Amino acid sequence: SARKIPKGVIHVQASFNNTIVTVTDVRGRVVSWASAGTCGFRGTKRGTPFAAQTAAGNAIRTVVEQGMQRAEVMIKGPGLGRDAALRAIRRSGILLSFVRDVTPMPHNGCRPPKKRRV
Amino acid sequence: SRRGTVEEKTAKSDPIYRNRLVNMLVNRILKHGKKSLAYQILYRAVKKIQQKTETNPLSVLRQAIRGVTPDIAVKARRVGGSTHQVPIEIGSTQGKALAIRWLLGAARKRPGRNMAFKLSSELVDAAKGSGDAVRKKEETHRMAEANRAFAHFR
Amino acid sequence: VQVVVDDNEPEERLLNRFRREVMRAGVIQECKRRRFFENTQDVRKRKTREAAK
RNA sequence: ACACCAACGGCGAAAGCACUCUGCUGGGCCGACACUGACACUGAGAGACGAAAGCUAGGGGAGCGAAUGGGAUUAGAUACCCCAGUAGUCCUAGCCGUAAACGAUGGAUACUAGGCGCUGUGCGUAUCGACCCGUGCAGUGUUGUAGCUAACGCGUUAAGUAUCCCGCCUGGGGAGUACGUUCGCAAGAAUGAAACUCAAAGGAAUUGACGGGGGCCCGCACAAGCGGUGGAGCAUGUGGUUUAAUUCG
């Protein structure tokens, strides 16, 4: 069983409502994912930093079948789950290699509504 | 805090065993100003416990209340508009005070016989894991650590 | 627009505070909301005028 | 549509205009000067330019988003908020010409205390240097002085002291509407009343209060905690009801 891929990039879609932590390989194929509204609590109880750690710590139950040694991290977008997702992945067992911020910086053109966030 | 500093309010120590922290248990079980009969609730629960246990009555009292003593509790503080359920870490001065309040209530919320057996039962039930006294330690831990993100670490 | 982790060593320290000065939530809170078109050139330049001298 | 650079920046008569490049093209400024020679200034009518929205015909349409359709909030909300979304927003041509089109202080010229920030140019042991000392344009703030102003404030880019010329006001509501003329495809624009009615509207500033404004502080005020009420039976007081009165406050 399993493909047994060495290292891989971890795409963390950090938003205000929730945080989707997905651990993918070298190419871009997802093995298994984990989210904030999946781990027990839902509604508005998520999106917080220590709710992101229970989400990123739920991935090591489904991706343990592959057996990854090293891991590169990748954060996208603002919110309370940027530095928190990196701390849970570190206390799990996998090593650090490349932490990058691929947040889409606009060239001042497209603008969404004002509205207050959580 | 700066204007008017009071340390603590203390009365006379424990009868013959000599202890000031155990003297708060006779002061909390105090019903309407009767310290003469409140002595008969604590000291008779010391006389009846020596058959159920082996060691000294001061030791079994301290080894059991550690399972009733909390480490972190929730306080209501508002900021910005919404009421935050921020958990502040409880110390040794307030933690020993919160342990004897839930052992007081659990003794009264069990209408069996007299208060000499009700306090003696909830004293050994904290060591094995039974009663309403030890359940409140794990119930306050359900409100805490679930709202861990509202408070930052030291 | 990424962040440097060009430093070696098997260290567990974040170092996400180095980019939280230039980029931060600042370039995203200036954006991602609605632009005022005229009040961006008026109100945002009026408060910086009195805070300068 | 174009981050960063962007700046209290710059350019333009106003509106307005910012990724880079090419093609055509306007205005402003400085400097040794060379030349004309007042050929100037303003300016009703008139002519031209006009943010956005809107309109006509033909295209385009990612996002946003009037309308409109659902969800939610609420006593109700055919609003705010959520999910979608048409005209529109974009391009070519024509049209409409309005805006707190605001520095709300028209243009042009000569004078009147000062202290800090741009761009050109001259000079400074050979400029040895980031620089130092001048001399012009445009542009902020200033405990800004005199003076001016009702006060706030302006202050040689003054509402300071004067000259040239044009536009405009002479109570509030009714009105910037009605009627007529003119303009427009239309929506409307421009010019512009009266009757009637009030004796007041309005501006600045002052004291106090108020604020779901801010900064800092004090009472069981909250918080921390104990006991209690509202449940129960009884006492007592008050409304409502009732009664000849169920006396009054």
Side-chain angles (χ1 to χ4, degrees):
Chain A
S1 189
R3 309 178 198 92
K4 290 138 184 174
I5 328 97
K7 58 175 181 294
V9 286
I10 310 163
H11 284 77
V12 185
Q13 188 69 72
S15 190
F16 284 110
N17 57 304
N18 71 321
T19 172
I20 308 167
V21 188
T22 176
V23 49
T24 168
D25 62 351
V26 197
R27 187 181 174 165
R29 296 179 176 191
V30 58
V31 294
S32 286
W33 54 271
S35 194
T38 307
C39 55
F41 34 80
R42 210 198 67 173
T44 185
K45 294 181 179 180
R46 71 274 238 277
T48 46
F50 285 84
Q53 290 185 228
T54 318
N58 194 78
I60 55 160
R61 187 182 289 211
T62 52
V63 308
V64 71
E65 56 175 285
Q66 307 297 132
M68 288 178 251
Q69 296 172 247
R70 295 178 297 184
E72 308 186 293
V73 212
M74 204 186 286
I75 40 168
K76 182 184 276 183
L80 301 83
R82 281 177 160 259
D83 56 284
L86 273 63
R87 286 168 61 213
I89 284 163
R90 218 159 284 155
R91 296 276 77 157
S92 288
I94 45 179
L95 218 68
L96 189 145
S97 293
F98 201 155
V99 352
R100 40 177 288 194
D101 203 14
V102 72
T103 180
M105 187 189 262
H107 285 13
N108 291 7
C110 181
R111 287 283 283 261
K114 285 277 282 181
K115 323 299 170 290
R116 302 185 69 92
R117 62 280 300 167
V118 291
Chain B
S1 188
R2 196 188 297 141
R3 304 178 75 238
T5 316
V6 185
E7 294 181 5
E8 61 172 293
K9 61 288 151 300
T10 180
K12 297 294 168 180
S13 57
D14 202 89
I16 194 72
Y17 241 107
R18 200 182 185 100
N19 245 40
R20 54 172 61 202
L21 59 158
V22 182
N23 205 81
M24 283 196 262
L25 181 48
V26 71
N27 284 325
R28 289 219 71 120
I29 220 283
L30 184 277
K31 198 175 87 296
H32 71 269
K34 286 171 68 182
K35 203 181 179 296
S36 300
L37 229 154
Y39 159 68
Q40 294 174 237
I41 307 302
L42 182 60
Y43 257 61
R44 233 196 68 87
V46 152
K47 189 76 176 182
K48 289 284 284 181
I49 209 73
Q50 62 180 297
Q51 195 182 78
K52 278 77 179 180
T53 190
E54 290 291 294
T55 186
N56 288 276
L58 223 186
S59 188
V60 73
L61 177 68
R62 210 181 67 201
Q63 289 288 296
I65 65 175
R66 283 295 299 258
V68 193
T69 302
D71 291 295
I72 185 164
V74 185
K75 278 184 175 64
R77 299 285 190 235
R78 197 241 70 168
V79 58
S82 55
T83 313
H84 285 188
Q85 299 289 287
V86 58
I88 295 90
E89 59 289 311
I90 310 300
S92 189
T93 178
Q94 295 181 286
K96 199 72 76 180
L98 277 165
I100 55 172
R101 292 177 196 168
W102 302 329
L103 212 146
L104 205 185
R108 296 190 70 175
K109 290 285 283 297
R110 191 183 176 128
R113 290 304 310 270
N114 297 101
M115 283 298 286
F117 187 65
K118 295 172 187 179
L119 196 72
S120 187
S121 58
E122 297 295 294
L123 207 65
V124 278
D125 274 43
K128 58 176 183 179
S130 293
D132 199 73
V134 75
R135 285 291 183 273
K136 203 66 192 299
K137 199 266 281 70
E138 294 294 291
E139 238 282 283
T140 188
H141 274 55
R142 282 179 177 97
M143 276 67 238
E145 286 197 279
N147 293 301
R148 208 191 300 161
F150 288 81
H152 210 288
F153 273 88
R154 301 90 65 173
Chain C
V1 288
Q2 287 172 214
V3 60
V4 264
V5 189
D6 214 47
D7 51 286
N8 214 73
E9 293 173 78
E11 283 293 301
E12 289 184 61
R13 293 181 178 115
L14 284 295
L15 211 65
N16 206 45
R17 189 66 265 272
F18 207 75
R19 199 55 157 178
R20 214 60 49 208
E21 297 179 283
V22 196
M23 275 228 302
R24 59 170 291 201
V27 293
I28 319 294
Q29 71 106 49
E30 185 191 76
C31 298
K32 268 206 179 64
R33 60 193 308 152
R34 180 195 160 270
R35 48 170 35 109
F36 321 98
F37 289 90
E38 53 113 339
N39 314 87
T40 317
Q41 304 291 109
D42 194 68
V43 190
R44 293 292 180 199
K45 288 186 179 180
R46 198 191 70 228
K47 58 165 286 180
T48 318
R49 182 181 151 263
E50 284 186 22
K53 74 280 173 178

